[PDB]
Amino acid sequence: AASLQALARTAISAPLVTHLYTADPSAHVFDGALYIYPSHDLDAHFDMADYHVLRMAHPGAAVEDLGQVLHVRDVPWAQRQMWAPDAAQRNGKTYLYFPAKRADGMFQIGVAVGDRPEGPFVAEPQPIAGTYSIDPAVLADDDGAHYLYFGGIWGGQLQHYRDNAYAQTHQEPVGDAPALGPRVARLHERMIDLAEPSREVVILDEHGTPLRADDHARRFFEGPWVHQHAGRYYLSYSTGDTHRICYATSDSPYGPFTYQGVLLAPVVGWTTHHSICLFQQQWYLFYHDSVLSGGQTHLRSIKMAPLAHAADGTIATIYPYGEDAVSPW
Ligand SMILES: O[C@@H]1[C@@H](O)[C@H](O)OC[C@H]1O
């Protein structure tokens, strides 16, 4: 636990907050300010039960904790494990999208509605029909549509689904079979329903071939995020056991997306999760690691670092402890 100490010393970001553990940061600019919707790690395994909302009033501002806005006890369909959330706005309402586990052990995604971005949010009684697995991200397209992206394998259970239907004997593909991708569905105007069944998002390599299941350096693992820049859509995501946030580009929110490279090098703690958000004069990467907790994977803190799109559209790799650091993974 001294190799950990080198990384803390050269970390490029300090924890945005330290009075509670935070993870899975989803950043949005709502109503002139930056709101962050992270998960809330509890210091008792990932047994989170509630969400807070954080805010930066302006660039460089101190980070405000706007308090708890949703608890699993008010989510009647869910039993436990309030994981990586996201938010969207429409018609003056704010919607909090969140993955949670039913009593029978299956993850699904539910939504909660509020009249302000800081809530409080009133959760719908049933989960969103046609969703499953975890890690929602809702893209507010320039054209006025909203798209829901979701999925995570391993613990996230996506591997048990094909064409939106569960099977106990559905497993993660192996070898030369195409790796599973995240799901995408346009949202209905009423925002709490999908407008359509979800579709597979396909990630391609440099030769236009879907990433293979045995390509763990690049294949989708969990936590999709999409942002728009310079006329293209950027899909970014965690690769899980290779500990990277990678990204790919498409001219459509539906893909297919062509793999581009690594956006974030490995962080301390097993998981890595992020969002990418434009705030006034600067794009930022929001991410998390386990430095604050001394390396405990399930006790995380969110961070932010400035991100840069080059003229050719690529995004240079961000190294959370410096390019020189010995990677934690
Ligand atoms: O949603 C997150 C998930 O992607 C990860 O596997 O573990 C922590 C969760 O909050």
Ligand SMILES: [Ca+2]
């Ligand atoms: Ca997310």
